[PDB]
Design a protein around this ligand. Structure first.
Ligand code: CO
Ligand code: CO
Length: 106
């Protein structure tokens, strides 16, 4: 039911972020690290973005310099449970702001 689908979609999200950041060619130095399954993106200004799994809830959480965002699996997207906004849009907006460079993955 929910557990296996969570593992499937989260594993895919992890890969998509990892691949996109390894393939980062822009001017800014952006680093991505995985520690205890948690992804940490680090920017040149020392700021970070942290992405982790909340297994009980089947949610992916985002922590940015600006706030914390909790995402529900909904179809082919991750949806911010307060605002309805998508995971990629919010991750791009924060990454763009923290890198001071467009960080656009679509
Ligand atoms: Co469960
Ligand atoms: Co490294």
């Amino acid at each position: 039911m929910n557990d296996s689908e969570f593992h499937r979609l989260a594993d895919q999200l992890w890969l998509t972020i990892e691949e996109r950041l390894d393939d980062w060619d822009g001017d800014s130095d952006i680093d991505c690290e995985i520690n205890g399954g948690v992804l940490t993106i680090t920017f040149e200004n020392g700021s970070k973005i942290i992405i982790n799994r909340q297994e009980p809830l089947h949610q992916v959480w985002l922590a940015t310099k600006q706030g914390g965002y909790h995402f529900d699996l909904k179809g082919d997207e991750w949806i911010c449970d307060r605002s309805g906004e998508t995971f990629w849009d919010l991750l791009e907006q924060a990454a763009t702001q923290q890198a001071g460079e467009t960080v656009s993955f679509r």
